[PDB]
Write a protein that binds this DNA or RNA. Structure first.
Ligand code: MG
Length: 569
DNA sequence: GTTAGACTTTAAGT
DNA sequence: ACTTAAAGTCTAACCTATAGGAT
DNA sequence: ATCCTATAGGA
């Protein structure tokens, strides 16, 4: 049919939401109890697809409230009621207490513990069973063991037509072209913080230099050139006249600006973080494309006669649910350039009727969605995140992994290794077998760990592991194969122009440790036949960094236009 | 004010 | 007491070995 | 025969 998705075809802490204890951490000194990190499996309504049910996987930390207990024995007022859940011994079959001090809040104010989605790192079923896909696999198998096929949940696959994969070579070429485009423009870094003792400017310059891009450090920001400012945190300053950010950015209006904190330029291990450099550079490129109203790299072709509208949220107060008409900014492709203007009241009066039923994605609220419109016929196109998560085919991956664990449970006899050495004298795997047999002793068999010097890469190694498999010793196998395709719906650009629906994801090969699910996007329309060039609007690989994108390319350009207006009007 | 996208905790609406 | 949207946190943004097809 | 370029399994 196509890729898998959380949309539903047919319909353990024991409450609303099925918690699966994943991780436990011990508290610091002078405290008792364990912090819990948990995964929730729940069935929820859909906002974007006709109230058809959806699956939801979500981290729900549980902490002890003895952490919050004061020195005098009193307990802090932060949510001191109505939340009582605790664990017993095993991660399932637990209990609570209506006056229990073990709550759903984290250890701190708004700390967000997070859990991986898929883990097949050493293709270990134990590491797999501690990720969201693994928890969902456990959920399905527990439901199956509990009820037979009487109670079953069937994720609705997506009708798939145009599944445009992307390789690491294509994205690598896209970014070498991108940074080649940046080579034409002057780039400046300036550190403006108080008592510049952190030397973050040197680290950022050295990070840029390894992408072969020239940058020069100066004392103060320079007009005309692309600027990077290391300024302190936003809340460090109290007055907007003394904050270097936005005084240097309202002093100069027609100048491209990117700014950074010091702390962001280093990782946990102390080496430079080289991703920050790339994101800064490509974001400056996008802002420059916005600012000169052209394209510095070849974007695809947009649909003809289309217009892209996008609101912006004021810096004002309640109007309770932003009911007051926001400014709305429009973008059009005209010849060799783009036009960005503000949408007048007459245009939006026409639009709110021509868009009609689907007006309320552009108006009435926060997060007002950009929408394409067509002057010629009043047909339009809306791109909305549906809340649907799309999953790699978990049941097959777990079916493979359980058999891998069963195979590695046995120890290979010396007799089989001797037979394999005798019967295949020209294979390259023999030398490692002879060495590991000489290191071993002829009485006891070899466990799997001493095979760790032998990998499932070469063709003779593949033959060796298949030959071990025919004897019942299923040591290693193939899981992330493109030809066999279990880890799709997490890879590459997808497209269904009959229904506009799409998603993005990883590039090239799946990773053993992937921790986010892609989201399916819906293009609501009044069309009978959607324009073909809606394919082209987001076959671009640098909005999301080094990845396929879920939002059309003119929308980000319009948004970086809008954000550039805070210091002009 | 690394960013987009996904994601989780908190706060406002009911 | 429950709901849902708004506010805010946070992690990846791969890497290298092997076979195969082309020249 | 040899060098590049997909395939995907380890760090
Ligand atoms: Mg920004």
């Amino acid at each position: 049919q196509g890729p898998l998705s959380t949309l539903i075809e047919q319909i353990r802490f024991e409450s609303e939401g099925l918690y699966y204890l994943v991780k436990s951490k011990k508290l610091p000194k002078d405290h008792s109890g364990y912090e819990l990190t948990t995964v929730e499996i729940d069935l929820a309504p859909c906002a974007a697809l006709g109230f058809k049910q959806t699956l939801s996987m979500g981290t729900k930390t549980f902490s002890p409230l003895s952490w919050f207990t004061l020195e005098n024995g009193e307990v802090q007022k932060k949510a001191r009621f109505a939340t009582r859940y605790q664990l017993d011994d095993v991660g399932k079959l637990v209990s609570k207490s209506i006056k229990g001090d073990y709550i759903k809040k984290p250890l701190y104010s708004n700390a967000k513990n997070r859990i991986q989605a898929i883990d097949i790192t050493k293709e270990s079923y134990s590491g797999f069973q501690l990720s969201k896909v693994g928890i969902l696999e456990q959920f399905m198998q527990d439901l199956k063991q509990a009820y037979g096929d009487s109670v079953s949940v069937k994720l609705q696959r997506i009708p798939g037509e145009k599944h445009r994969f992307v390789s690491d070579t294509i994205v690598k070429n896209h970014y070498v072209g991108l940074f080649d485009a940046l080579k034409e423009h002057r780039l400046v870094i300036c550190d403006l913080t108080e008592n510049q003792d952190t030397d973050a400017a040197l680290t950022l310059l050295h990070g840029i230099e390894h992408l072969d891009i020239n940058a020069e450090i100066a004392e103060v920001p320079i007009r005309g050139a692309l600027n990077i400012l290391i300024v302190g945190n936003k809340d460090t300053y109290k007055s907007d006249e003394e904050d270097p950010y936005q005084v240097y950015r309202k002093k100069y209006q027609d100048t491209v600006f990117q700014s950074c904190y010091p702390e962001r330029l280093w990782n946990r291990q102390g080496q430079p973080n080289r991703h920050v450099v790339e994101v800064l550079l490509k974001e400056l490129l996008i802002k420059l494309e916005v600012h000169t109203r052209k394209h510095l790299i070849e974007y695809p072709s947009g649909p003809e006669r289309c217009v892209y509208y996008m609101p912006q949220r004021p810096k004002d107060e309640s109007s309770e649910v932003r009911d007051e008409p926001w400014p709305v900014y429009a973008s059009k492709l005209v010849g060799d350039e783009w036009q960005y203007t503000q949408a007048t009241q007459e245009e939006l009066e026409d639009i709110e009727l021509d868009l009609g039923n689907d007006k309320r994605h552009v108006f009435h609220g926060f997060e007002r969605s950009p929408v394409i419109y067509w002057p010629e016929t009043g047909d339009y196109a809306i791109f909305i995140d549906t809340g649907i998560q799309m999953l790699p085919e978990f049941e097959a991956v777990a079916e493979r992994l359980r058999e891998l664990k069963e195979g590695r449970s046995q120890d290979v006899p010396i007799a089989l290794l001797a037979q394999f050495i005798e019967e295949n004298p020209e294979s390259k795997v023999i030398n490692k077998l002879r060495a590991i047999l000489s290191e071993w002793d002829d009485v006891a068999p070899l466990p799997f760990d001493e095979f760790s010097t032998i990998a499932y890469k070469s063709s003779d190694e593949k033959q060796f592991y298949d030959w071990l498999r025919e004897q019942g010793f299923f040591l290693k196998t193939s899981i992330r194969g493109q030809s066999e395709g279990f880890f799709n719906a997490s890879l590459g650009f997808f497209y269904n122009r009959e229904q506009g629906m799409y998603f993005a994801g990883g590039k090239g090969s799946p990773q053993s440790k992937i921790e986010t699910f892609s989201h399916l996007y819906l293009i609501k329309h009044s069309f009978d036949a959607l324009p073909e060039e809606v394919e082209n609007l987001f076959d671009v690989y640098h909005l999301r960094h080094r990845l396929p994108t879920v939002t059309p390319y003119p929308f980000k350009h319009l948004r970086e236009y809008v954000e550039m207006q805070r210091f002009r009007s």
